[PDB]
């Protein structure tokens, strides 16, 4: 409720700061790539006569 946080400002700052810290932490341990994994599986079979 807006009314709830209007009268309790310090609490709101605490929710915001936690969400931000959580992001910062993930950012250090989150992988980076150009594209999301999109390669289709392939199997090749080989035989010689």
């Amino acid at each position: 409720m807006a009314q709830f946080f209007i009268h309790r400002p310090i609490f709101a700052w605490v929710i915001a700061l936690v969400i931000m810290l959580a992001g910062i932490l993930t950012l250090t341990k989150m992988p980076i790539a150009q594209y999301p994994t999109i390669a289709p599986p392939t199997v090749t079979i080989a035989a010689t006569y």
């Binding site: 309790r8 310090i10 609490f11 605490v14 929710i15 700061l17 936690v18 810290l21």
Partner: protein
């Protein structure tokens, strides 16, 4: 296990320092005061 153990030890200090920041933030939202939390934080070494 020799190879594995070496890497494992360094990490533990930081979790202790992360926990403290989070606890301070929680305390503050409970009391609505930035300062009150410091008294509760002080008590920790006494226990250990």
């Amino acid at each position: 296990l020799s190879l594995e153990e070496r890497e494992s030890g360094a990490q533990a200090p930081f979790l202790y320092a992360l926990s403290l920041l989070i606890v301070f933030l929680c305390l503050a939202a409970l009391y609505e005061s930035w300062s009150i939390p410091f008294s509760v934080l002080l008590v920790v070494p006494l226990g250990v």
